Amino acid sequence: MREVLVPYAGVSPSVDSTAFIAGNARIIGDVCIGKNASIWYGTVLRGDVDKIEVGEGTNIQDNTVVHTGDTVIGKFVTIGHSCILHACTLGNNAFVGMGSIVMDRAVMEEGSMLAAGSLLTRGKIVKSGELWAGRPAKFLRMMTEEEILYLQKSAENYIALSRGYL
Amino acid sequence: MREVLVPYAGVSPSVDSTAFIAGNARIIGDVCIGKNASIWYGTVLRGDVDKIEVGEGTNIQDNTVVHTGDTVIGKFVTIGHSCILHACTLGNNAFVGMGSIVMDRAVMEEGSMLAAGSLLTRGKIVKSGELWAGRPAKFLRMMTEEEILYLQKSAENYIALSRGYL
Amino acid sequence: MREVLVPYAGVSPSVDSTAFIAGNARIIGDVCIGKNASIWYGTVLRGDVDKIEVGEGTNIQDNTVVHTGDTVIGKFVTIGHSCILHACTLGNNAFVGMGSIVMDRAVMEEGSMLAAGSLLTRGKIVKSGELWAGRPAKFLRMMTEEEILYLQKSAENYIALSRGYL
Ligand SMILES: [Mg+2]
Ligand SMILES: [Mg+2]
Ligand SMILES: [Mg+2]
């Protein structure tokens, strides 16, 4: 973790011992990583200018960049590969499809979803149970029962997956 | 390759000795890399949950993520920078434009192409000789003679390019 | 910098001593990096086939890939996270929004801007003072006074930010 955890302005990340951090991830400055979280290969959480909080049981998948107004990510959140997250707030069980961009001041409420490849623009609010999609992302429809159930299942799957590394 | 090749659940990648693997690439678990393939900087081939196969003479360019239903990539395939490939099948001489996302169960037939920045959604089939583009990607037109010739040329160029590293 | 700077065909990068280069960046071959530039985590500047020039005071943010017709990037340019730049020319004070793709032969004139998530296609010219957006990117509007001022401010902010690492 000597190469993985980087200080900025005297602040170093606080990482729960049960979190999985890929050896080539980079976590800089004011970043807190909760119990059973998993931060994947090539992910960059750059908390130099403002803070990043990552809740229990959250996965931030490969090559995602988080940087900024801080970034607050709740519990059991799934962030797909190669996302870009910028001073946003993601509620518990939020699901961000791979290849999505979430802009400054955007909010995903608890149990909401963004389709793969979405661009959620500044200040937009995805409400609980909603699926948004597109560029710029807009409300598409409510989620099905299967999709809602998958929010927690995805997070649990990733906790289990990450335990096969450590 | 000690840092580059990562075991998962007792399985480590099988890499042909003639393949180029960038020193900061990460290849995990059940992944097979063929003769003269080239896997570029910051690429992540994560074969933890299911297998990834990469055929002879294929290039997977920088910062691409492959992860999942397995991912089967044929021979002399070009995958551009910063793509995301998810349980898909790419036939020989398929060409995936940089910054594209290929979703679960999508298929590119032999000698087909996706434009840069495309989003090929679940289960869609790009037929041989076709060029698809957009988000969601849809049929645009057939490829020109020059474009069809370029499928093999791109792959050969990358084999030659990669030999200047090793 | 032993792992960061990579020779290709006998050519190694030329990096100003005042430039910040993240320890996991990869800079290959014919690449020149100017005074006070900053090249961020997971960025790949691959100057194997042709040259890459990066002017004074320019930031190229995390996980961006630059590769190709060469790539000429001027002074005090801001390139956002996870961009892909391909044989293009970016004038002084150009601003490329995060998650954008700039294709071969595209030009951004001095003091022009691309919105986040744009796809600037081959040979397109963004004129000074213009904001382009979309996929394919097209002229949206001229920039406001605040936006024009921000071009230089962004670059100065990044110089200052990078000095807290070195
Ligand atoms: Mg930023
Ligand atoms: Mg995946
Ligand atoms: Mg290229």
Name all domains of chain B by residue range, CATH numbers in brackets.
1-166 (2.160.10.10)
Measure the N-to-C terminal CA separation of chain B; round to a whole number of Å.
13
Interface of B with C (CB under 8 A): 22-24, 40-42, 61-63, 80-82, 98-99, 116-117, 135, 161, 164-165
Strand A84-85 with A71-73, pairing: unpaired
Cα angle C146-C152-C158, degrees, rounded to a multiple of 5: 115
* Dihedral angle sign, alpha carbons of residues C93, C94, C98, C104: negative
Rounded CA-CA distance C152/C102 in Å is: 21
Phi-psi category of A90—alpha, beta or left, where left has phi over 0 and alpha has psi -120 to 50?
beta
Nearest CA among C84, C46, C76 for reference residue C59: C76
Single-letter amino acid code for the residue at C65: V
Helix (H), strand (E) counts: chain B:
1, 20
DSSP state of B152: H
Q: Are C128 and A130 in contact (CB under 8 A)?
A: no
- Which residues make up the environment of ion ligand 3, defined by Cβ < 5 Å? C 67
In contact, C61 and C44? CB cutoff 8 Å: no
* One-letter amino acid of C143: M
Asked whether the beta carbons of B79 and B63 are under 8 A apart, the reply is no
Q: Are A31 and A11 in contact (CB under 8 A)?
A: no
What's the CA-to-centroid distance between A58 and ligand 2, angstroms?
14
Chains that touch B (3 or more CB pairs under 8 A): A, C
Q: Which one-letter amino acid corresponds to residue B65?
A: V
Cα A69 to Cα A46: distance, rounded to the nearest angstrom: 13
Give, rounded to a whole angstrom, the gap between the first and last alpha carbons of chain C.
13
Q: Residue B157 in 3-state DSSP?
A: helix
Burial state string for A76-107 with b = 16 or more CB within 10 A and e = fewer than 16: bbbbbbbbbbbbbbbbbbbbbbbbbbbbebbb
Q: Helix, strand, or coil here: B105?
A: coil
* Experimentally determined by: X-ray
Which one of A60, A84, A98 would you mutate to disrupt binding with C, by most C Cβ within 10 Å of its Cβ? A84
Task: Please answer whether residues C135 and C115 qualify as being in contact, where contact means their C-beta atoms are separated by less than 8 angstroms.
Answer: no
3-class SS string, A68-84: CCCEEECCCCEECCCCE
Sign of CA dihedral A56, A122, A133, A22: negative
Residues of A with CB under 8 A from a CB of C: 3, 6, 8-9, 24, 26, 28, 42, 44, 46, 48-49, 63, 65, 67, 82, 84, 86, 101, 103, 119, 135
CA distance linking residue C133 with residue C124, whole number of Å: 12
Q: Pull the structure tokens for residue C24.
A: 């996991």
Scored b (16 or more CB within 10 A) or e, C28-67 reads bbbbbbbebbbbbbbbbbbbbbebbbbbbbbbbbbbbbbb
